[PDB]
Each structure stands twice: as structure tokens, then as C-alpha cells.
Design a protein around this ligand. Structure first.
Ligand SMILES: O=C1CC[C@H](N2Cc3cc(-c4cc(CN5CCCC5)c5ccn(C6COC6)c5n4)ccc3C2=O)C(=O)N1
Ligand SMILES: [Zn+2]
Ligand SMILES: [Zn+2]
Lengths: 110, 26
């Protein structure tokens, strides 16, 4: 009985809720994306997330959503990798930010 | 930051941050 998606690894923190979900790509809400090194990430796109800290500075390298830049995002409690914050590189994009949360990093399984 | 994580793209200045991070992917 919950609407929330929590850190699989510590399960102490809610990251987002089902109602944040949207399809940025007409690939639906959650598609498989491949990183440059062969890691596939079923990344769910949500408008808002919380309890996440950022690593590094934003990059556009190999961005899965062109126009947006990624910044690594991890659990504030366990530091487990959760996904990325995506921030638009152009003023005319919408939204200006969302998050892409990796499926294998959340409970329940989506 | 010359240390990069192949899994997610995190970059680090210190080797030791990388090690910490990579362990968590386990
Ligand atoms: O929307 C998204 C979310 C993020 C996601 N990404 C991007 C990414 C990038 C890197 C990365 C980056 C760099 C730096 N560059 C290369 C020279 C110019 C700058 C290097 C250099 C070396 N390596 C490897 C490790 O050591 C050999 C590098 N890996 C590792 C993982 C990921 C990843 O998941 C994605 O594809 N798209
Ligand atoms: Zn956690
Ligand atoms: Zn990583």
C-alpha cells in the first residue's frame, strides 16, 4: 500500500512517487538505455525526486535525451547510485529538469 | 576529474572516491 519508489539498497528513503512519472521519450516512461561502455539502464523519467545528492558537474556526453545534460545522482543515506538529474541545455526545452532513475536501484521493481 | 565510473559516468579526482563508489555498485 504505497505510491513511492525507495532506495532498494537502504530502503530508508523515498526517492519519488508513481505520480511523478511521465514519458519524456515516446519510448514510454521507462525504456532501456545503453551507456558508452555497454551497461544497459532501464531508466524511468520522473518530474521530481528527493533525498538524492549529486556527484560531478553536469555533462551532455552520450546524453540519452538530447538537449539535456546528466549529473549522477545517489541516495543521501547509503550513497548508492540511483540515476541522473537531467537539466536542459537550451531555454526552449520543457521541462527544464527531470530525473532518470535506474530501475535496478529502486523498490518496488517497476 | 580523471577517474570515471563506467557504470554511471561519475567522475572523481581521488582514486579512493572511485573505489568507494565502485563498491556501492555491488
Ligand atoms: O543520459 C545519460 C546518462 C549518463 C550515461 N553515461 C555517460 C557515461 C560516461 C562515462 C565516461 C565518460 C568519460 C569522459 N569522456 C570521455 C572523453 C571525453 C569525456 C570517460 C573517459 C573514460 N571512460 C571510461 C571509464 O574509464 C574508461 C569514460 N566514461 C561512463 C559512464 C557513463 C554513463 O552511464 C549516458 O550514457 N547517458
Ligand atoms: Zn539508500
Ligand atoms: Zn558509477
Amino acid at each position: 500500500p504505497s505510491t513511492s519508489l525507495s532506495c532498494k539498497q537502504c530502503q530508508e528513503t523515498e526517492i519519488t512517487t508513481k505520480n511523478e512519472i511521465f514519458s519524456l521519450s515516446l519510448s514510454g516512461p521507462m525504456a532501456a538505455y545503453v551507456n558508452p561502455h555497454g551497461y544497459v539502464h532501464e531508466t524511468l523519467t520522473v518530474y521530481k525526486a528527493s533525498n538524492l545528492n549529486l556527484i560531478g558537474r553536469p555533462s551532455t556526453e552520450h546524453s540519452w535525451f538530447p538537449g539535456y545534460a546528466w549529473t549522477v545522482a545517489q541516495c543521501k543515506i547509503c550513497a548508492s547510485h540511483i540515476g541522473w538529474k537531467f537539466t536542459a541545455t537550451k531555454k526552449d526545452m520543457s521541462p527544464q529538469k527531470f530525473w532518470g532513475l535506474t530501475r535496478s536501484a529502486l523498490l518496488p521493481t517497476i | 576529474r580523471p577517474f570515471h565510473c563506467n557504470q554511471c559516468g561519475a567522475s572523481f579526482t581521488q582514486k579512493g572516491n572511485l573505489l568507494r563508489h565502485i563498491k556501492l555498485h555491488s
